[PDB]
JSON list of C-alpha atoms in Angstrom, two decimals:
[
{"chain": "A", "resi": 2, "resn": "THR", "atom": "CA", "xyz": [-20.67, 65.63, -25.22]},
{"chain": "A", "resi": 3, "resn": "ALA", "atom": "CA", "xyz": [-21.57, 63.72, -27.74]},
{"chain": "A", "resi": 4, "resn": "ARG", "atom": "CA", "xyz": [-25.12, 65.41, -28.28]},
{"chain": "A", "resi": 5, "resn": "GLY", "atom": "CA", "xyz": [-22.84, 68.63, -28.62]},
{"chain": "A", "resi": 6, "resn": "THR", "atom": "CA", "xyz": [-20.58, 66.98, -31.25]},
{"chain": "A", "resi": 7, "resn": "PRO", "atom": "CA", "xyz": [-20.34, 65.69, -34.85]},
{"chain": "A", "resi": 8, "resn": "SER", "atom": "CA", "xyz": [-19.91, 62.19, -35.44]},
{"chain": "A", "resi": 9, "resn": "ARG", "atom": "CA", "xyz": [-18.27, 59.68, -38.17]},
{"chain": "A", "resi": 10, "resn": "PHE", "atom": "CA", "xyz": [-18.08, 56.16, -38.77]},
{"chain": "A", "resi": 11, "resn": "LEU", "atom": "CA", "xyz": [-14.55, 54.60, -39.05]},
{"chain": "A", "resi": 12, "resn": "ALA", "atom": "CA", "xyz": [-13.04, 54.73, -42.17]},
{"chain": "A", "resi": 13, "resn": "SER", "atom": "CA", "xyz": [-9.54, 54.76, -43.74]},
{"chain": "A", "resi": 14, "resn": "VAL", "atom": "CA", "xyz": [-8.75, 57.04, -46.93]},
{"chain": "A", "resi": 15, "resn": "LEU", "atom": "CA", "xyz": [-8.40, 54.91, -49.69]},
{"chain": "A", "resi": 16, "resn": "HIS", "atom": "CA", "xyz": [-8.50, 51.47, -48.05]},
{"chain": "A", "resi": 17, "resn": "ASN", "atom": "CA", "xyz": [-4.96, 52.45, -47.11]},
{"chain": "A", "resi": 18, "resn": "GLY", "atom": "CA", "xyz": [-3.64, 48.91, -45.61]},
{"chain": "A", "resi": 19, "resn": "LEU", "atom": "CA", "xyz": [-5.49, 46.54, -48.15]},
{"chain": "A", "resi": 20, "resn": "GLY", "atom": "CA", "xyz": [-3.03, 46.95, -50.90]},
{"chain": "A", "resi": 21, "resn": "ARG", "atom": "CA", "xyz": [-0.31, 48.57, -49.72]},
{"chain": "A", "resi": 22, "resn": "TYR", "atom": "CA", "xyz": [0.41, 51.10, -46.31]},
{"chain": "A", "resi": 23, "resn": "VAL", "atom": "CA", "xyz": [0.63, 54.78, -47.76]},
{"chain": "A", "resi": 24, "resn": "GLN", "atom": "CA", "xyz": [1.62, 57.38, -45.42]},
{"chain": "A", "resi": 25, "resn": "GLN", "atom": "CA", "xyz": [-1.22, 59.97, -45.43]},
{"chain": "A", "resi": 26, "resn": "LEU", "atom": "CA", "xyz": [0.93, 63.05, -43.76]},
{"chain": "A", "resi": 27, "resn": "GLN", "atom": "CA", "xyz": [2.21, 64.79, -46.87]},
{"chain": "A", "resi": 28, "resn": "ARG", "atom": "CA", "xyz": [3.66, 67.91, -45.53]},
{"chain": "A", "resi": 29, "resn": "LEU", "atom": "CA", "xyz": [4.80, 69.56, -42.47]},
{"chain": "A", "resi": 30, "resn": "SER", "atom": "CA", "xyz": [5.35, 73.37, -41.51]},
{"chain": "A", "resi": 31, "resn": "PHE", "atom": "CA", "xyz": [7.54, 74.66, -39.01]},
{"chain": "A", "resi": 32, "resn": "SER", "atom": "CA", "xyz": [7.52, 78.15, -37.94]},
{"chain": "A", "resi": 33, "resn": "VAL", "atom": "CA", "xyz": [10.56, 78.72, -35.79]},
{"chain": "A", "resi": 34, "resn": "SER", "atom": "CA", "xyz": [11.87, 82.29, -34.48]},
{"chain": "A", "resi": 35, "resn": "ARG", "atom": "CA", "xyz": [15.91, 82.67, -34.49]},
{"chain": "A", "resi": 36, "resn": "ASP", "atom": "CA", "xyz": [15.27, 85.00, -30.99]},
{"chain": "A", "resi": 37, "resn": "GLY", "atom": "CA", "xyz": [12.57, 84.15, -28.66]},
{"chain": "A", "resi": 38, "resn": "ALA", "atom": "CA", "xyz": [12.04, 81.41, -25.49]},
{"chain": "A", "resi": 39, "resn": "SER", "atom": "CA", "xyz": [8.77, 80.58, -27.05]},
{"chain": "A", "resi": 40, "resn": "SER", "atom": "CA", "xyz": [11.13, 78.57, -29.89]},
{"chain": "A", "resi": 41, "resn": "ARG", "atom": "CA", "xyz": [13.64, 77.47, -28.09]},
{"chain": "A", "resi": 42, "resn": "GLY", "atom": "CA", "xyz": [12.89, 73.82, -27.73]},
{"chain": "A", "resi": 43, "resn": "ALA", "atom": "CA", "xyz": [11.67, 74.05, -31.78]},
{"chain": "A", "resi": 44, "resn": "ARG", "atom": "CA", "xyz": [14.84, 75.20, -32.28]},
{"chain": "A", "resi": 45, "resn": "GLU", "atom": "CA", "xyz": [17.09, 72.86, -30.47]},
{"chain": "A", "resi": 46, "resn": "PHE", "atom": "CA", "xyz": [14.36, 70.03, -32.31]},
{"chain": "A", "resi": 47, "resn": "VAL", "atom": "CA", "xyz": [15.49, 71.36, -35.81]},
{"chain": "A", "resi": 48, "resn": "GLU", "atom": "CA", "xyz": [18.97, 71.41, -34.72]},
{"chain": "A", "resi": 49, "resn": "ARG", "atom": "CA", "xyz": [19.04, 67.87, -34.05]},
{"chain": "A", "resi": 50, "resn": "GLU", "atom": "CA", "xyz": [15.91, 65.69, -34.83]},
{"chain": "A", "resi": 51, "resn": "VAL", "atom": "CA", "xyz": [14.07, 67.23, -37.79]},
{"chain": "A", "resi": 52, "resn": "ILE", "atom": "CA", "xyz": [16.92, 65.23, -40.46]},
{"chain": "A", "resi": 53, "resn": "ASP", "atom": "CA", "xyz": [16.50, 62.40, -38.45]},
{"chain": "A", "resi": 54, "resn": "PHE", "atom": "CA", "xyz": [12.92, 62.36, -39.08]},
{"chain": "A", "resi": 55, "resn": "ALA", "atom": "CA", "xyz": [12.99, 63.56, -42.29]},
{"chain": "A", "resi": 56, "resn": "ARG", "atom": "CA", "xyz": [15.04, 60.47, -43.64]},
{"chain": "A", "resi": 57, "resn": "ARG", "atom": "CA", "xyz": [12.65, 58.37, -41.91]},
{"chain": "A", "resi": 58, "resn": "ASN", "atom": "CA", "xyz": [9.83, 59.67, -43.82]},
{"chain": "A", "resi": 59, "resn": "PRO", "atom": "CA", "xyz": [10.70, 60.76, -47.50]},
{"chain": "A", "resi": 60, "resn": "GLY", "atom": "CA", "xyz": [6.78, 60.63, -48.09]},
{"chain": "A", "resi": 61, "resn": "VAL", "atom": "CA", "xyz": [6.63, 64.34, -46.40]},
{"chain": "A", "resi": 62, "resn": "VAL", "atom": "CA", "xyz": [8.07, 67.14, -47.14]},
{"chain": "A", "resi": 63, "resn": "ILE", "atom": "CA", "xyz": [9.33, 69.46, -44.12]},
{"chain": "A", "resi": 64, "resn": "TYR", "atom": "CA", "xyz": [9.14, 73.03, -44.63]},
{"chain": "A", "resi": 65, "resn": "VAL", "atom": "CA", "xyz": [11.35, 74.99, -41.56]},
{"chain": "A", "resi": 66, "resn": "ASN", "atom": "CA", "xyz": [9.99, 79.21, -42.14]},
{"chain": "A", "resi": 67, "resn": "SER", "atom": "CA", "xyz": [12.39, 80.48, -39.74]},
{"chain": "A", "resi": 68, "resn": "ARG", "atom": "CA", "xyz": [10.84, 84.21, -38.71]},
{"chain": "A", "resi": 69, "resn": "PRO", "atom": "CA", "xyz": [10.00, 86.23, -36.49]},
{"chain": "A", "resi": 70, "resn": "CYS", "atom": "CA", "xyz": [7.38, 84.70, -34.23]},
{"chain": "A", "resi": 71, "resn": "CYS", "atom": "CA", "xyz": [5.44, 85.10, -30.91]},
{"chain": "A", "resi": 72, "resn": "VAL", "atom": "CA", "xyz": [4.41, 81.17, -30.88]},
{"chain": "A", "resi": 73, "resn": "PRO", "atom": "CA", "xyz": [6.09, 78.24, -33.06]},
{"chain": "A", "resi": 74, "resn": "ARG", "atom": "CA", "xyz": [3.99, 76.13, -34.88]},
{"chain": "A", "resi": 75, "resn": "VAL", "atom": "CA", "xyz": [3.71, 72.90, -37.07]},
{"chain": "A", "resi": 76, "resn": "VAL", "atom": "CA", "xyz": [0.87, 72.85, -39.70]},
{"chain": "A", "resi": 77, "resn": "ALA", "atom": "CA", "xyz": [0.45, 69.17, -40.60]},
{"chain": "A", "resi": 78, "resn": "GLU", "atom": "CA", "xyz": [-1.35, 68.69, -44.22]},
{"chain": "A", "resi": 79, "resn": "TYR", "atom": "CA", "xyz": [-2.64, 64.96, -45.65]},
{"chain": "A", "resi": 80, "resn": "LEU", "atom": "CA", "xyz": [-3.39, 64.00, -48.77]},
{"chain": "A", "resi": 81, "resn": "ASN", "atom": "CA", "xyz": [-7.04, 63.66, -48.05]},
{"chain": "A", "resi": 82, "resn": "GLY", "atom": "CA", "xyz": [-6.59, 67.16, -48.11]},
{"chain": "A", "resi": 83, "resn": "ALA", "atom": "CA", "xyz": [-6.76, 67.78, -44.27]},
{"chain": "A", "resi": 84, "resn": "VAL", "atom": "CA", "xyz": [-5.03, 70.65, -42.25]},
{"chain": "A", "resi": 85, "resn": "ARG", "atom": "CA", "xyz": [-3.93, 70.28, -38.65]},
{"chain": "A", "resi": 86, "resn": "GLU", "atom": "CA", "xyz": [-2.16, 73.39, -37.25]},
{"chain": "A", "resi": 87, "resn": "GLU", "atom": "CA", "xyz": [-0.44, 72.38, -33.53]},
{"chain": "A", "resi": 88, "resn": "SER", "atom": "CA", "xyz": [1.46, 74.93, -31.45]},
{"chain": "A", "resi": 89, "resn": "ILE", "atom": "CA", "xyz": [4.89, 73.65, -30.30]},
{"chain": "A", "resi": 90, "resn": "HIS", "atom": "CA", "xyz": [5.18, 77.12, -28.20]},
{"chain": "A", "resi": 91, "resn": "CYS", "atom": "CA", "xyz": [7.50, 76.69, -24.97]},
{"chain": "A", "resi": 92, "resn": "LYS", "atom": "CA", "xyz": [7.85, 72.38, -25.38]},
{"chain": "A", "resi": 93, "resn": "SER", "atom": "CA", "xyz": [10.44, 70.68, -25.00]},
{"chain": "A", "resi": 94, "resn": "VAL", "atom": "CA", "xyz": [12.54, 68.46, -27.82]},
{"chain": "A", "resi": 95, "resn": "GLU", "atom": "CA", "xyz": [10.66, 65.59, -26.56]},
{"chain": "A", "resi": 96, "resn": "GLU", "atom": "CA", "xyz": [7.52, 66.77, -26.75]},
{"chain": "A", "resi": 97, "resn": "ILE", "atom": "CA", "xyz": [8.09, 67.96, -30.19]},
{"chain": "A", "resi": 98, "resn": "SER", "atom": "CA", "xyz": [9.24, 64.71, -31.79]},
{"chain": "A", "resi": 99, "resn": "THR", "atom": "CA", "xyz": [6.27, 63.06, -29.75]},
{"chain": "A", "resi": 100, "resn": "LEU", "atom": "CA", "xyz": [3.92, 65.48, -31.49]},
{"chain": "A", "resi": 101, "resn": "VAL", "atom": "CA", "xyz": [5.28, 65.54, -34.57]},
{"chain": "A", "resi": 102, "resn": "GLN", "atom": "CA", "xyz": [5.68, 61.41, -34.81]},
{"chain": "A", "resi": 103, "resn": "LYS", "atom": "CA", "xyz": [2.12, 61.58, -33.79]},
{"chain": "A", "resi": 104, "resn": "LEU", "atom": "CA", "xyz": [0.93, 63.41, -36.51]},
{"chain": "A", "resi": 105, "resn": "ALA", "atom": "CA", "xyz": [3.10, 61.08, -39.09]},
{"chain": "A", "resi": 106, "resn": "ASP", "atom": "CA", "xyz": [0.97, 58.33, -37.68]},
{"chain": "A", "resi": 107, "resn": "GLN", "atom": "CA", "xyz": [-2.29, 60.20, -37.73]},
{"chain": "A", "resi": 108, "resn": "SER", "atom": "CA", "xyz": [-4.05, 59.92, -41.00]},
{"chain": "A", "resi": 109, "resn": "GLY", "atom": "CA", "xyz": [-6.31, 63.10, -42.53]},
{"chain": "A", "resi": 110, "resn": "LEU", "atom": "CA", "xyz": [-9.63, 61.82, -40.78]},
{"chain": "A", "resi": 111, "resn": "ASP", "atom": "CA", "xyz": [-11.15, 64.29, -38.02]},
{"chain": "A", "resi": 112, "resn": "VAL", "atom": "CA", "xyz": [-10.90, 63.54, -34.46]},
{"chain": "A", "resi": 113, "resn": "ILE", "atom": "CA", "xyz": [-14.37, 63.40, -33.54]},
{"chain": "A", "resi": 114, "resn": "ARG", "atom": "CA", "xyz": [-16.72, 60.68, -32.08]},
{"chain": "A", "resi": 115, "resn": "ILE", "atom": "CA", "xyz": [-16.19, 57.44, -33.69]},
{"chain": "A", "resi": 116, "resn": "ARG", "atom": "CA", "xyz": [-19.63, 55.73, -33.44]},
{"chain": "A", "resi": 117, "resn": "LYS", "atom": "CA", "xyz": [-18.57, 52.10, -33.83]},
{"chain": "A", "resi": 118, "resn": "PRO", "atom": "CA", "xyz": [-15.34, 51.00, -33.01]},
{"chain": "A", "resi": 119, "resn": "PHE", "atom": "CA", "xyz": [-15.23, 48.65, -36.07]},
{"chain": "A", "resi": 120, "resn": "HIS", "atom": "CA", "xyz": [-15.67, 48.77, -39.63]},
{"chain": "A", "resi": 121, "resn": "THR", "atom": "CA", "xyz": [-16.90, 46.09, -42.52]},
{"chain": "A", "resi": 122, "resn": "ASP", "atom": "CA", "xyz": [-18.27, 46.49, -46.07]},
{"chain": "A", "resi": 123, "resn": "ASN", "atom": "CA", "xyz": [-19.22, 42.56, -45.93]},
{"chain": "A", "resi": 124, "resn": "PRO", "atom": "CA", "xyz": [-20.94, 41.64, -42.50]},
{"chain": "A", "resi": 125, "resn": "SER", "atom": "CA", "xyz": [-22.48, 38.91, -43.41]},
{"chain": "A", "resi": 126, "resn": "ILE", "atom": "CA", "xyz": [-21.37, 35.73, -44.91]},
{"chain": "A", "resi": 127, "resn": "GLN", "atom": "CA", "xyz": [-24.25, 33.00, -44.54]},
{"chain": "A", "resi": 128, "resn": "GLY", "atom": "CA", "xyz": [-27.16, 35.64, -45.28]},
{"chain": "A", "resi": 129, "resn": "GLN", "atom": "CA", "xyz": [-28.26, 38.56, -42.83]},
{"chain": "A", "resi": 130, "resn": "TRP", "atom": "CA", "xyz": [-31.32, 37.93, -40.78]},
{"chain": "A", "resi": 131, "resn": "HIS", "atom": "CA", "xyz": [-34.74, 38.02, -42.11]},
{"chain": "A", "resi": 132, "resn": "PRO", "atom": "CA", "xyz": [-38.39, 36.71, -40.28]},
{"chain": "A", "resi": 133, "resn": "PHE", "atom": "CA", "xyz": [-38.41, 34.08, -42.52]},
{"chain": "A", "resi": 134, "resn": "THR", "atom": "CA", "xyz": [-35.16, 32.94, -41.87]},
{"chain": "A", "resi": 135, "resn": "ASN", "atom": "CA", "xyz": [-35.65, 30.14, -39.19]},
{"chain": "A", "resi": 136, "resn": "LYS", "atom": "CA", "xyz": [-39.50, 29.77, -40.35]},
{"chain": "A", "resi": 137, "resn": "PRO", "atom": "CA", "xyz": [-40.20, 26.09, -42.14]},
{"chain": "A", "resi": 138, "resn": "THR", "atom": "CA", "xyz": [-42.04, 26.32, -45.04]},
{"chain": "A", "resi": 139, "resn": "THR", "atom": "CA", "xyz": [-45.54, 24.32, -45.98]},
{"chain": "A", "resi": 140, "resn": "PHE", "atom": "CA", "xyz": [-46.88, 22.49, -48.63]},
{"chain": "A", "resi": 141, "resn": "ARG", "atom": "CA", "xyz": [-49.18, 24.28, -51.39]},
{"chain": "A", "resi": 142, "resn": "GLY", "atom": "CA", "xyz": [-47.79, 27.62, -49.75]},
{"chain": "A", "resi": 143, "resn": "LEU", "atom": "CA", "xyz": [-51.11, 27.44, -47.79]},
{"chain": "A", "resi": 144, "resn": "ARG", "atom": "CA", "xyz": [-51.41, 30.42, -45.15]},
{"chain": "A", "resi": 145, "resn": "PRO", "atom": "CA", "xyz": [-52.74, 29.74, -41.56]},
{"chain": "A", "resi": 146, "resn": "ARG", "atom": "CA", "xyz": [-56.98, 29.28, -42.07]},
{"chain": "A", "resi": 147, "resn": "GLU", "atom": "CA", "xyz": [-56.89, 28.89, -45.69]},
{"chain": "A", "resi": 148, "resn": "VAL", "atom": "CA", "xyz": [-58.74, 26.27, -47.55]},
{"chain": "A", "resi": 149, "resn": "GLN", "atom": "CA", "xyz": [-57.09, 25.99, -50.78]},
{"chain": "B", "resi": 51, "resn": "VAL", "atom": "CA", "xyz": [40.31, 104.12, -41.68]},
{"chain": "B", "resi": 52, "resn": "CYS", "atom": "CA", "xyz": [38.15, 101.26, -40.31]},
{"chain": "B", "resi": 53, "resn": "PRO", "atom": "CA", "xyz": [39.60, 97.85, -41.05]},
{"chain": "B", "resi": 54, "resn": "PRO", "atom": "CA", "xyz": [37.16, 95.15, -42.10]},
{"chain": "B", "resi": 55, "resn": "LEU", "atom": "CA", "xyz": [35.75, 92.96, -39.61]},
{"chain": "B", "resi": 56, "resn": "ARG", "atom": "CA", "xyz": [37.97, 89.72, -39.22]},
{"chain": "B", "resi": 57, "resn": "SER", "atom": "CA", "xyz": [36.17, 86.44, -39.40]},
{"chain": "B", "resi": 58, "resn": "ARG", "atom": "CA", "xyz": [36.42, 84.39, -36.40]},
{"chain": "B", "resi": 59, "resn": "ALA", "atom": "CA", "xyz": [37.13, 81.31, -38.35]},
{"chain": "B", "resi": 60, "resn": "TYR", "atom": "CA", "xyz": [40.25, 79.61, -37.90]},
{"chain": "B", "resi": 61, "resn": "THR", "atom": "CA", "xyz": [41.69, 76.05, -38.91]},
{"chain": "B", "resi": 62, "resn": "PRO", "atom": "CA", "xyz": [45.18, 74.74, -37.08]},
{"chain": "B", "resi": 63, "resn": "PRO", "atom": "CA", "xyz": [48.13, 74.69, -39.64]},
{"chain": "B", "resi": 64, "resn": "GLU", "atom": "CA", "xyz": [49.87, 71.64, -40.04]},
{"chain": "B", "resi": 65, "resn": "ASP", "atom": "CA", "xyz": [52.96, 72.67, -38.86]},
{"chain": "B", "resi": 66, "resn": "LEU", "atom": "CA", "xyz": [51.83, 74.17, -35.83]},
{"chain": "B", "resi": 67, "resn": "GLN", "atom": "CA", "xyz": [54.64, 72.38, -33.71]},
{"chain": "B", "resi": 68, "resn": "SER", "atom": "CA", "xyz": [57.36, 73.67, -35.70]},
{"chain": "B", "resi": 69, "resn": "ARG", "atom": "CA", "xyz": [55.77, 77.27, -35.26]},
{"chain": "B", "resi": 70, "resn": "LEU", "atom": "CA", "xyz": [55.35, 76.90, -31.71]},
{"chain": "B", "resi": 71, "resn": "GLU", "atom": "CA", "xyz": [58.83, 75.27, -31.29]},
{"chain": "B", "resi": 72, "resn": "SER", "atom": "CA", "xyz": [60.48, 78.28, -33.51]},
{"chain": "B", "resi": 73, "resn": "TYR", "atom": "CA", "xyz": [58.51, 81.28, -30.99]},
{"chain": "B", "resi": 74, "resn": "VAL", "atom": "CA", "xyz": [59.66, 79.36, -27.75]},
{"chain": "B", "resi": 75, "resn": "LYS", "atom": "CA", "xyz": [63.17, 79.15, -28.69]},
{"chain": "B", "resi": 76, "resn": "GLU", "atom": "CA", "xyz": [63.02, 82.97, -29.68]},
{"chain": "B", "resi": 77, "resn": "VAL", "atom": "CA", "xyz": [60.74, 84.65, -26.72]},
{"chain": "B", "resi": 78, "resn": "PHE", "atom": "CA", "xyz": [62.94, 82.11, -24.37]},
{"chain": "B", "resi": 82, "resn": "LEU", "atom": "CA", "xyz": [66.01, 75.95, -25.26]},
{"chain": "B", "resi": 83, "resn": "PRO", "atom": "CA", "xyz": [65.40, 73.33, -22.68]},
{"chain": "B", "resi": 84, "resn": "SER", "atom": "CA", "xyz": [64.26, 69.68, -23.49]},
{"chain": "B", "resi": 85, "resn": "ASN", "atom": "CA", "xyz": [60.57, 68.64, -23.09]},
{"chain": "B", "resi": 86, "resn": "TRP", "atom": "CA", "xyz": [59.97, 72.65, -24.10]},
{"chain": "B", "resi": 87, "resn": "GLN", "atom": "CA", "xyz": [56.32, 71.57, -23.50]},
{"chain": "B", "resi": 88, "resn": "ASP", "atom": "CA", "xyz": [56.31, 71.63, -19.86]},
{"chain": "B", "resi": 89, "resn": "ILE", "atom": "CA", "xyz": [57.89, 75.24, -20.04]},
{"chain": "B", "resi": 90, "resn": "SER", "atom": "CA", "xyz": [56.26, 77.23, -17.54]},
{"chain": "B", "resi": 91, "resn": "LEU", "atom": "CA", "xyz": [54.32, 80.31, -18.46]},
{"chain": "B", "resi": 92, "resn": "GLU", "atom": "CA", "xyz": [54.26, 81.88, -14.95]},
{"chain": "B", "resi": 93, "resn": "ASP", "atom": "CA", "xyz": [56.13, 84.87, -15.40]},
{"chain": "B", "resi": 94, "resn": "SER", "atom": "CA", "xyz": [53.93, 87.69, -17.00]},
{"chain": "B", "resi": 95, "resn": "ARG", "atom": "CA", "xyz": [56.88, 89.25, -19.75]},
{"chain": "B", "resi": 96, "resn": "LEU", "atom": "CA", "xyz": [57.55, 86.04, -21.20]},
{"chain": "B", "resi": 97, "resn": "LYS", "atom": "CA", "xyz": [53.40, 84.38, -21.42]},
{"chain": "B", "resi": 98, "resn": "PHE", "atom": "CA", "xyz": [52.65, 87.85, -23.04]},
{"chain": "B", "resi": 99, "resn": "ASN", "atom": "CA", "xyz": [55.59, 88.01, -25.38]},
{"chain": "B", "resi": 100, "resn": "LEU", "atom": "CA", "xyz": [54.66, 84.34, -26.84]},
{"chain": "B", "resi": 101, "resn": "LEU", "atom": "CA", "xyz": [50.88, 85.10, -26.50]},
{"chain": "B", "resi": 102, "resn": "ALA", "atom": "CA", "xyz": [50.90, 87.97, -28.70]},
{"chain": "B", "resi": 103, "resn": "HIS", "atom": "CA", "xyz": [53.77, 86.71, -30.91]},
{"chain": "B", "resi": 104, "resn": "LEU", "atom": "CA", "xyz": [51.16, 83.84, -31.99]},
{"chain": "B", "resi": 105, "resn": "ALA", "atom": "CA", "xyz": [47.78, 86.21, -31.78]},
{"chain": "B", "resi": 106, "resn": "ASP", "atom": "CA", "xyz": [49.52, 88.34, -34.56]},
{"chain": "B", "resi": 107, "resn": "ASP", "atom": "CA", "xyz": [50.94, 85.15, -36.35]},
{"chain": "B", "resi": 108, "resn": "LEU", "atom": "CA", "xyz": [47.48, 82.88, -36.14]},
{"chain": "B", "resi": 109, "resn": "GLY", "atom": "CA", "xyz": [44.98, 86.07, -36.60]},
{"chain": "B", "resi": 110, "resn": "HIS", "atom": "CA", "xyz": [43.72, 84.47, -33.60]},
{"chain": "B", "resi": 111, "resn": "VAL", "atom": "CA", "xyz": [43.82, 84.84, -29.94]},
{"chain": "B", "resi": 112, "resn": "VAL", "atom": "CA", "xyz": [43.31, 83.29, -26.68]},
{"chain": "B", "resi": 113, "resn": "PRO", "atom": "CA", "xyz": [40.10, 85.06, -24.66]},
{"chain": "B", "resi": 114, "resn": "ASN", "atom": "CA", "xyz": [40.78, 86.22, -21.38]},
{"chain": "B", "resi": 115, "resn": "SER", "atom": "CA", "xyz": [38.68, 83.23, -19.89]},
{"chain": "B", "resi": 116, "resn": "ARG", "atom": "CA", "xyz": [41.12, 80.74, -21.41]},
{"chain": "B", "resi": 117, "resn": "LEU", "atom": "CA", "xyz": [44.24, 83.06, -19.79]},
{"chain": "B", "resi": 118, "resn": "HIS", "atom": "CA", "xyz": [44.19, 81.71, -16.51]},
{"chain": "B", "resi": 119, "resn": "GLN", "atom": "CA", "xyz": [44.16, 77.94, -18.20]},
{"chain": "B", "resi": 120, "resn": "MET", "atom": "CA", "xyz": [47.14, 78.65, -20.14]},
{"chain": "B", "resi": 121, "resn": "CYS", "atom": "CA", "xyz": [49.78, 77.55, -17.24]},
{"chain": "B", "resi": 122, "resn": "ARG", "atom": "CA", "xyz": [52.33, 75.75, -19.99]},
{"chain": "B", "resi": 123, "resn": "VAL", "atom": "CA", "xyz": [53.11, 75.69, -23.17]},
{"chain": "B", "resi": 124, "resn": "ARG", "atom": "CA", "xyz": [51.53, 72.25, -23.53]},
{"chain": "B", "resi": 125, "resn": "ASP", "atom": "CA", "xyz": [48.22, 74.23, -22.54]},
{"chain": "B", "resi": 126, "resn": "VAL", "atom": "CA", "xyz": [48.77, 76.97, -25.67]},
{"chain": "B", "resi": 127, "resn": "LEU", "atom": "CA", "xyz": [49.72, 73.98, -28.12]},
{"chain": "B", "resi": 128, "resn": "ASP", "atom": "CA", "xyz": [46.21, 72.07, -27.12]},
{"chain": "B", "resi": 129, "resn": "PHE", "atom": "CA", "xyz": [44.27, 75.34, -27.39]},
{"chain": "B", "resi": 130, "resn": "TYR", "atom": "CA", "xyz": [45.53, 76.15, -31.18]},
{"chain": "B", "resi": 131, "resn": "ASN", "atom": "CA", "xyz": [45.02, 72.73, -32.19]},
{"chain": "B", "resi": 132, "resn": "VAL", "atom": "CA", "xyz": [41.26, 73.26, -31.74]},
{"chain": "B", "resi": 133, "resn": "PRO", "atom": "CA", "xyz": [39.71, 74.42, -34.79]},
{"chain": "B", "resi": 134, "resn": "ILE", "atom": "CA", "xyz": [36.62, 77.21, -34.67]},
{"chain": "B", "resi": 135, "resn": "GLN", "atom": "CA", "xyz": [34.37, 77.72, -37.62]},
{"chain": "B", "resi": 136, "resn": "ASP", "atom": "CA", "xyz": [32.71, 81.24, -38.15]},
{"chain": "B", "resi": 137, "resn": "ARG", "atom": "CA", "xyz": [29.31, 80.60, -40.13]},
{"chain": "B", "resi": 138, "resn": "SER", "atom": "CA", "xyz": [25.42, 81.59, -39.10]},
{"chain": "B", "resi": 139, "resn": "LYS", "atom": "CA", "xyz": [23.10, 79.18, -38.34]},
{"chain": "B", "resi": 140, "resn": "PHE", "atom": "CA", "xyz": [21.30, 79.23, -41.88]},
{"chain": "B", "resi": 141, "resn": "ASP", "atom": "CA", "xyz": [24.55, 77.93, -43.31]},
{"chain": "B", "resi": 142, "resn": "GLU", "atom": "CA", "xyz": [25.50, 75.70, -40.69]},
{"chain": "B", "resi": 143, "resn": "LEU", "atom": "CA", "xyz": [21.82, 73.86, -41.34]},
{"chain": "B", "resi": 144, "resn": "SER", "atom": "CA", "xyz": [22.20, 73.91, -45.50]},
{"chain": "B", "resi": 145, "resn": "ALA", "atom": "CA", "xyz": [25.68, 72.16, -45.27]},
{"chain": "B", "resi": 146, "resn": "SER", "atom": "CA", "xyz": [24.57, 69.46, -42.77]},
{"chain": "B", "resi": 147, "resn": "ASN", "atom": "CA", "xyz": [23.88, 67.46, -46.02]},
{"chain": "B", "resi": 148, "resn": "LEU", "atom": "CA", "xyz": [20.01, 68.11, -46.18]},
{"chain": "B", "resi": 149, "resn": "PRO", "atom": "CA", "xyz": [18.11, 65.06, -47.25]},
{"chain": "B", "resi": 150, "resn": "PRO", "atom": "CA", "xyz": [15.59, 66.31, -50.63]},
{"chain": "B", "resi": 151, "resn": "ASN", "atom": "CA", "xyz": [12.43, 66.46, -48.76]},
{"chain": "B", "resi": 152, "resn": "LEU", "atom": "CA", "xyz": [13.73, 69.22, -46.27]},
{"chain": "B", "resi": 153, "resn": "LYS", "atom": "CA", "xyz": [13.66, 72.74, -46.91]},
{"chain": "B", "resi": 154, "resn": "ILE", "atom": "CA", "xyz": [15.37, 75.32, -44.99]},
{"chain": "B", "resi": 155, "resn": "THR", "atom": "CA", "xyz": [14.37, 79.05, -45.50]},
{"chain": "B", "resi": 156, "resn": "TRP", "atom": "CA", "xyz": [15.46, 82.04, -43.90]},
{"chain": "B", "resi": 157, "resn": "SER", "atom": "CA", "xyz": [13.29, 85.32, -43.46]},
{"chain": "B", "resi": 158, "resn": "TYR", "atom": "CA", "xyz": [15.65, 87.53, -41.56]}
]
């Protein structure tokens, strides 16, 4: 629930797409087992898909560890300094490729409740409403029931 | 007393045709020698044993029945086999600079 969870406003890292778009994902670490059914899909991913992904995303450094492990994992690091650990345990190649692409598309901002589906730093052009907007001025600036 | 372990790595020789022709001629002569049947066990054994010792690579038990004719033997010996670890296979896959693979085994 919202009351049970932290929230944030919609934001970018450094006004990402304003000047030029910079891919937020920086590093991607994979822990894969040579032997082990959990990492089967992961192995097949490393065999076919990771090379092409690396070519497509030159800004991201990909590390493949290939060590004994019961659960294979992918660790995603972002420019803002966020770290995300995602289990690729007993996942197909398609599922892993999907997940990895999602990580590439995501920024480092926390996946929590976003308060407003829009964000602007200049909401007003004509000038924000105040009580004296849409009020006429009076001669000599006389208050009601003022003699002088 | 124990010979060193042999690699499974085999590259088909360019002059494989001539080698096979000579060995068929030795073991068995007729025209269209590719179509010579290996139904006889003696002749088949002799040919395959000779080729195994010479090329250092042997037809597996599973593929033995498939070797009906000399053509099949030629087809088998023109297929390369690469013997290398997966780490070596990944490394020699022309990796991009951003991709880095390590082996903890």
